[PDB]
Write a protein that binds this ligand. Structure first.
Ligand SMILES: Cc1ncc(COP(=O)(O)O)c(CN[C@@H](C)P(=O)(O)O)c1O
Ligand SMILES: Cc1ncc(COP(=O)(O)O)c(CN[C@@H](C)P(=O)(O)O)c1O
Lengths: 381, 380
């Protein structure tokens, strides 16, 4: 693939491989690994990350909704895929033909599904139990038993798994986490038979308590080399390798005189002769206007963003005159300087998860494997 | 093109059409309207908006960078396109072959392009002049003449136009806008022969002083029905029709008891027995975590977003029990209630420009034209 603007993101597939292989080592042999690649692999590239994770030791994948699962199948993925969120009862046959498992938490959903489906492909379900996250999942025994019965009665409905999800597994204090786990244990008792797959752990629960994972973990954030929470960093079993970096280049360089203003609202003023650089990245690329008090890396040195960030461009105060074309690193390392996604997240006043997901479709992803470029993906190419 | 999650954006091309047509009436028959459709038409859909705009009175289109212009061509658009930002001198032949005009502001760029291109297609250039925005553009006379001499000298280089861009055209106080407009007129006198197209106004400047728009107008934000700024609203010549709306549906409903917590970090606790609804939209969709305490519309009533917003989901406090499938409007109207992109931007502490752009590729766009559904665009 080709791109014609000097702004791009890089995905180190070697980092992804290692993060997943280190986990395969950590977890008991009886515990499967399901790589979470929803939201285009958290902005890292769905098919690329899925491929690497599966070769690193993962055996199944998970996405947020049906379209994401169909896209993976489209791109050639053959491994089992579970849709973690809601879906339409009417789309049951489509998912079944495509060998896509669905999460279920309501008996009325199955009522509607049975009315519209009768074979020949089976639908594998994963019953979601709400133990304290308050999002999706059953909460009472009655509904739990009815769901199982409706599935058990239809010839083409199969109960493949059952799970829950944690709201605070990334907090050093484990009061709530412990509550949910014990809650899960009690609710599991409502099931007449234990499904082949029982799971609860995400990245944080997996890495901290590998001995409390049942037989499948759903590995997400850590697979990308990102800490579930900076607070549990010291508690991580092995070093994480960040797989995402973002770059650009100077497309214009000029020396302002004292008094000249920069960007919208004439908000910035060069009060001394200074060199200003312009890069081809803005808020429509995920470099939100909010990151205007932040900085970037140029010539291994930090250069602050100057004035308001524009839709496709922004300016920075250069330390001195530099040539057009000089590489700029928004996320990554330059010499003795480094900008991490956690750094960006802190200035955006968010969590690392949100950062790469916001880097828009507009920005090409260059994939590296075995330290060499493996491929380029330009969504608008 | 269909989709399988109950979250989608709706784009009213009739609003797009009316906003543009209304400007065409405001401007003279000589003045061209250049529809700014970069960033996938500010998150509204590049092809769909480009087509509609042309039908309504636009004669040209503008994008941010080469890839955006090439994607339009591939999608069938055969109308003129100008790349507003920078490009590689090595890509000059590709732009020329695709009939894509390029913005230029450095003589060294031309020296490079010249050594790399010799035909057969001519390449149209638009010289950018920096009059106070401090982003792109030439700033001195010598460089301006050197650029022009390089263009006139090349058999396949054509200087089709020249322009500048305003930094404060949306501010009631017009002093910096004035300095800029006057600096432009001054720098224009550095050129030997004036090019066919001379432009400088965006939505604000063109709607405010359409009499001072020269040969072309670059119409962006107002085409989408959004005000360039809150302070200019009472200065707009005609009412703008908002083209973008966003909706979802409840996929789960349940009653919590006091003391029960919702979402990550359990930052929310039900103080009383309440009905909670779960919708399939989150920050990976552009619905940023910062909107946690924002209100959405459900059953014609405002319902607050409760708990931390997730990557693909979030929870809201319902007025009471409602059936799964109930329509939720994040941006739009429901009964007497309406939430505008401006309301969302106020909560996010940003400008309206940023909001539709952030609504991601995951969210399908349903287009309406002539009060009927024309097409569904599901990027994935
Ligand atoms: C059901 C389910 N199973 C596993 C994971 C993986 O978790 P990690 O990324 O912390 O390893 C998630 C993640 N989801 C959060 C991003 P969000 O809730 O914001 O979608 C999930 O929802
Ligand atoms: C050169 C240029 N010509 C015209 C327009 C249209 O302006 P309106 O959207 O206010 O009508 C723009 C817009 N660009 C801003 C969104 P941003 O500067 O953040 O990209 C521009 O850059």
């Amino acid at each position: 693939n080709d791109f014609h603007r000097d702004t791009w993101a890089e995905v180190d597939l070697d980092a992804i491989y290692d993060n997943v292989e280190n986990l395969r080592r950590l977890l008991p042999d009886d515990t499967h690994i399901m790589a979470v690649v929803k939201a285009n692999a958290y902005g890292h590239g769905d098919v690329q990350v899925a491929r690497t994770a599966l070769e690193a030791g993962a055996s199944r994948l998970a996405v947020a909704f049906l379209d994401e699962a169909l896209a993976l199948r489209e791109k050639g993925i053959e491994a089992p895929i579970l849709v973690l969120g809601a879906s339409r009862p009417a789309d049951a046959a489509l998912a079944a033909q495509q060998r896509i498992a669905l999460t279920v938490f309501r008996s009325d959903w199955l009522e509607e599904a049975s009315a519209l489906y009768s074979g020949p492909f089976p639908i594998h379900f994963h019953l979601k139990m709400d133990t304290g996250m308050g999002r999706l999942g059953v909460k009472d025994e009655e509904e739990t038993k009815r769901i199982v019965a409706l599935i058990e009665r239809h010839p083409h409905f199969v109960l493949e798994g059952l799970y829950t999800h944690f709201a605070t597994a990334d907090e050093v204090n484990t009061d709530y986490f412990s509550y949910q786990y014990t809650r899960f244990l009690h609710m599991l008792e409502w099931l007449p038979s234990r499904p082949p797959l029982v799971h609860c752990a995400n990245s944080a629960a997996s890495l901290r308590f590998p001995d409390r994972t049942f037989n499948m973990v759903r590995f997400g954030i850590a697979m990308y080399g990102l800490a579930p929470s900076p607070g549990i960093k010291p508690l991580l079993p092995y070093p994480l390798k960040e797989a995402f970096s973002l770059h650009s280049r100077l497309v214009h360089v000029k020396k302002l005189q004292p008094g000249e203003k920069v960007s919208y609202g004439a908000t910035y003023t060069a009060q001394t002769e200074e060199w200003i650089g312009t890069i081809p990245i803005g808020y429509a690329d995920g470099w939100l206007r909010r990151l205007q008090h932040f900085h970037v890396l140029v010539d291994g040195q930090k250069a602050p963003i100057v004035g308001r960030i524009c839709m496709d461009q922004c300016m920075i105060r250069l330390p001195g005159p530099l040539p057009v074309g000089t590489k700029v690193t928004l996320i990554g390392r330059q010499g003795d300087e480094v900008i991490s996604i956690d750094d960006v997240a802190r200035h955006l006043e968010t969590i690392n998860y949100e950062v790469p997901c916001t880097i828009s479709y507009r920005v090409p992803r260059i994939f590296f494997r075995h330290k060499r470029i493996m491929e380029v993906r330009n969504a608008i190419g």
